[PDB]
Design a binder for these strands. Structure first.
Ligand SMILES: [Zn+2]
Lengths: 136, 141, 357, 38
RNA sequence: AGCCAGGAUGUUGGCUUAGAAGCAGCCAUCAUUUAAAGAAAGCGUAAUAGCUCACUGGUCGAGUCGGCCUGCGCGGAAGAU
């Protein structure tokens, strides 16, 4: 499970998904998955996606992970009166603005990559599109 | 000419009399029995070459007797006495296990004049070369 | 020197041969080939599957031990020509295919140590002292030392884990771990109660003693703490808490019962006020009970396995260490060793192969 | 006839059909592979 | 888009696996006759044999194929007088 090593702080604000993506263009590999819908990827989700893509590949080529869960979600225990401070850190999310290329891949056919990214999309919460490596 | 009734292409070494451990029930299944593969199969063996897996036609008949004309021995088994090596694929082009010369290949080719439907010897030679390459023997030019 | 080794190998093969039934398995193979050579054998798939593989497994023994007898002779003949004519290459080619034969023999030897689910795994042995009071203790320590010597000779890490020393001198109970390649295979056949006859040094009148000490050998198992029970296997049901609380407890589904679907084990809880604490507490309790169920079933299976071994009885008395007459007679060996001092110094090679057979 | 929300052509013989609203799959070769959105 | 036949041989490519010849698995994945035929794509045999497809010569006679681009539409879509 992908979780930050050393933390400056334990808890955080809910924040806003407001804005546009910075990790937009396909950088490393040949075939990437761009995020159409804005949202948040939990750490578990990410791992599931990774699993899906590994299975799709059947151990083949090289896969990149541009995204990483930077913000923790603090959830209160079940059936608690609203006050008494913040809850406890349960899982880690990365806030996804529209346009974020999530996972990149090379060494495989395009169709195969697409298939992999379909599986990944199934695991993931948000709507996505397949993109290729761009010159300039 | 009569249409195809029943055939099962299953043969082993020509030197061995009566195929029964490797092939088994397959040859003696439909019409022609097990015992008709030691007197008929060894009769055509003596004329050409002994101790080599050569395929033979087994067009089965209702009259128990079957017609057979054997071909010239395969490229897979002719490329063993002149090739030098025994082992083939698995790790063929990953690491070179044997060596093959073009002249040798050509020589091997010339024997199968009746086996292959071809107008020229060069074509046959190149087919043989291809076969060798497939097996795992890299052609030396 | 090399030619005499060939003969030894041949002898070894021959002795192996009788037990593995060369005259019976070759006959067995005759009957399979009588039915399976006929095209109409796949009327019954169920039986044919069990026989088809069996025959294939038996062909790799009978025919190979025939290729051994055929092999040794040829190599010997190969050797003879070279030495006589002072040729060198054939000498080297005579050793290299004799070499194959040893490996084959090992494989067949390995096949004896292959039979069973646990063989190559880590190994434990408990040497429990008998009823002798002091003599038994003395025996146990000796046994331990012998085992250690054997371990040293074979080439294994020997780790004494528990060691309860004797009240006067010796060992009351000792557990040693022996790790390595097929470590349990050599030691599985050593399991049993050891009959020691001796003129004791602890007896003031110097009586002769029939003494016993168990050497129970068992393999190290995979831990397997608890299987993660998926929500499809649990049946979660909520209801009202029994008792007092006005309008509140009368109107709560706080109490929970969890039932394991295939088993039938049911765990309830109505302790805490919240449903959600109870659900996870009664699951924690449910998990605990599942472990017990799995622990208890494993223990009963063990119990039943050991009650088989109990009904062997006097057969547990395996190897009679007649030290008062030097000779040692193991029940399955049928042979006596006149050098007790070598036996005690870890040379049980004469006893492993015979007891395994 | 399977109950689905995703009616995918699992093989070549599978045939997508909209029968007055309801989306359906029917396979000629396989009786299992026929599906229904519901 | 239909239909008529071929759709292979050198070949059983080879190495293999309780049984694999395209199909428990691993790799080569070249050439012959060529109008085409993959060392065979999906069914199927105990492995073979067999049913087909990619492709190929004819017939039929005009547009057809899959991408995104959104506009709207279905399903997905079930409650209690
Ligand atoms: Zn279908």
């Amino acid at each position: 499970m992908l979780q930050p090593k050393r933390t400056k702080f334990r808890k955080m604000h809910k924040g806003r998904n407001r804005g546009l993506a910075q990790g937009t263009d396909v950088s490393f590999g040949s075939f990437g998955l761009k995020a159409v819908g804005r949202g948040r990827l939990t750490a578990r989700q990410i791992e599931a996606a990774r699993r899906a893509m590994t299975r799709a590949v059947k151990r083949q080529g090289k896969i990149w992970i541009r995204v990483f869960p930077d913000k923790p979600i603090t959830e209160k225990p079940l059936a608690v009166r609203m006050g008494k401070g913040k809850g406890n850190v349960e899982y880690w999310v990365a806030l996804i603005q529209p346009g974020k290329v999530l996972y990149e891949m090379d060494g495989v056919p395009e169709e195969l990559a697409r298939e992999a990214f379909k599986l990944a999309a199934a695991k993931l919460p948000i709507k996505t599109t397949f993109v290729t490596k761009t010159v300039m | 000419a009569k249409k195809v009734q029943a055939y099962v292409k299953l043969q082993v070494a020509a030197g061995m009399a009566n195929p029964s451990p490797p092939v088994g029930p397959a040859l003696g299944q439909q019409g022609v029995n097990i015992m008709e593969f030691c007197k008929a199969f060894n009769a055509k063996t003596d004329s050409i070459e002994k101790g080599l897996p050569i395929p033979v036609v087994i067009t089965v008949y209702a009259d128990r007797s079957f017609t057979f004309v054997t071909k010239t021995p395969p490229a897979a088994v002719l490329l063993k006495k002149a090739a030098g090596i025994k082992s083939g694929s698995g790790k063929p082009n990953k690491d070179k296990v044997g060596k093959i010369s073009r002249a040798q290949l050509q020589e091997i080719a010339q024997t199968k004049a009746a086996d292959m439907t071809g107008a020229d010897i060069e074509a046959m030679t190149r087919s043989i070369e291809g076969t060798a390459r497939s097996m795992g023997l890299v052609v030396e030019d | 020197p090399v030619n005499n080794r060939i003969q030894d190998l041949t002898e070894r093969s021959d002795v192996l041969r009788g037990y593995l039934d060369y005259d019976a398995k070759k006959e067995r193979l005759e009957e399979v080939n009588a039915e399976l050579e006929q095209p109409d054998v796949w009327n019954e798939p169920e039986r044919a599957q069990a026989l088809g593989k069996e025959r294939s497994s038996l062909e790799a023994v009978v025919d190979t031990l025939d290729q051994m007898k055929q092999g040794l002779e040829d190599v010997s003949g190969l050797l003879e020509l070279a030495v006589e004519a002072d040729d060198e290459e054939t000498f080297n080619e005579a050793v290299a295919e004799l070499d194959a034969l040893e490996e084959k023999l090992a494989q067949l030897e390995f096949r004896r140590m292959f039979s069973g689910e646990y063989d190559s795994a880590d190994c434990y042995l408990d040497i429990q002292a008998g009823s002798g009071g002091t003599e038994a203790q003395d025996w146990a320590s000796m046994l331990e030392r012998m085992y250690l010597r054997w371990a040293e000779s074979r080439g294994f890490k020997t780790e004494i884990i528990e060691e309860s020393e004797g009240e006067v001198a010796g060992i009351k109970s000792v557990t040693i771990k022996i790790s390595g390649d097929y470590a349990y295979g050599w030691l599985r056949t050593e399991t049993g109660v050891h009959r020691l006859v001796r003129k004791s040094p602890f007896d003031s009148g110097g009586r002769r003693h029939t003494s016993f000490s168990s050497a129970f050998v068992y393999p190290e198992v995979d831990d397997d703490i608890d299987i993660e029970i998926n929500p499809a296997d649990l049946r979660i049901d909520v209801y009202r808490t029994s008792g007092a609380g006005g309008q509140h407890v009368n109107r709560t589904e706080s109490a929970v019962r969890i039932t394991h679907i295939p088993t039938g084990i049911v765990t309830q809880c109505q302790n805490d006020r919240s449903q959600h604490k109870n659900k996870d507490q009664a699951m924690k309790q449910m998990k605990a009970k599942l472990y017990e169920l799995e622990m208890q079933k494993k223990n009963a299976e063990k119990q039943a396995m050991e009650d088989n071994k109990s009904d062997i009885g006097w057969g547990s008395q395996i190897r009679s260490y007649v030290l008062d007459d030097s000779r040692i007679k193991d029940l399955r060996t049928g042979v006596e060793t006149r050098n007790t001092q070598a036996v005690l110094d870890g040379s049980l090679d004469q006893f492993i192969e015979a007891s395994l057979k | 006839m399977k109950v689905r929300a995703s009616v995918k052509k699992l093989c070549r013989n599978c045939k997508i059909v909209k029968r007055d609203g309801v989306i359906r799959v029917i396979c000629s070769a396989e009786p299992k592979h026929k599906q229904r959105q519901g």
